[PDB]
């Protein structure tokens, strides 16, 4: 309960601030005021046009690397095992294969952005 009460209070406080922000000030809305900003001149083309991602390969690698830490975060608990010979070997094994995969992507120029 304490947790749900705390989250509700925070996000309700934020919502009230927005409600006041919109209903308290005097408004004067017209077309030019609400037009998209681009340093004084009208934009050329929609902002919804495709925006090329030059780090796309690092982004996919992040998915694989971000799952590795899910496998590693239990390590503080795994260190309480009596079978420490196996646990230490498999912990080091997993991290090394992460390093090998990093070294492969590095040496193969996967970490350089497409130009």
């Amino acid at each position: 309960m304490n947790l749900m009460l705390a989250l509700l209070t925070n996000f309700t406080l934020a919502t009230l601030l927005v409600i006041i922000a919109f209903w308290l000030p005097q408004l004067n809305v017209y077309s030019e005021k609400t037009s998209p900003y681009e340093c004084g001149f009208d934009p050329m083309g929609s902002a919804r046009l495709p925006f090329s991602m030059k780090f796309f390969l690092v982004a996919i690698t992040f998915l694989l690397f971000d799952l590795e830490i899910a496998l590693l975060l239990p390590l503080p608990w795994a260190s309480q095992t009596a079978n420490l010979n196996t646990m230490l070997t498999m912990a080091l094994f997993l991290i090394i294969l992460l390093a090998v995969s990093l070294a492969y992507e590095w040496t193969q120029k996967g970490l350089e952005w497409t130009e």
Binding site: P50, F56, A59, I60, T61, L63, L64, D66, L67, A70, L71
Partner: protein
């Protein structure tokens, strides 16, 4: 069964239908694949946690790992599809009818 299973099984079915009923964007279907795995994770976690199957508690974690390998694989193909045609539309992938 317990009522929670009604909504988790329902969520899996919704995503399965979402996967099988394509629209245009290939990214939208890849999302339905990720949703299907999320329902399987939750459905498996409930069973394992409720039955106190201690060693099975690692199984949902292993499920996520191969979920990411699938998502990464799906995104890799999306990049190539996008490079070829300039969209991720699935109607462009019709060369192999002939």
């Amino acid at each position: 069964m317990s009522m929670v299973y009604m909504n988790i099984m329902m969520a899996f079915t919704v995503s399965l239908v979402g996967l099988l009923m394509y629209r245009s964007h290939l990214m939208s279907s890849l999302l339905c694949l990720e949703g299907m795995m999320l329902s399987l994770f939750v459905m498996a976690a409930l069973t394992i946690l409720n039955s106190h199957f201690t060693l099975a508690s690692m199984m949902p974690i292993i499920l996520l790992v191969f979920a990411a390998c699938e998502a990464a694989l799906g995104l890799s193909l999306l990049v190539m599809v996008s490079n070829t045609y300039g969209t991720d539309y699935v109607q462009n992938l019709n060369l192999l009818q002939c």
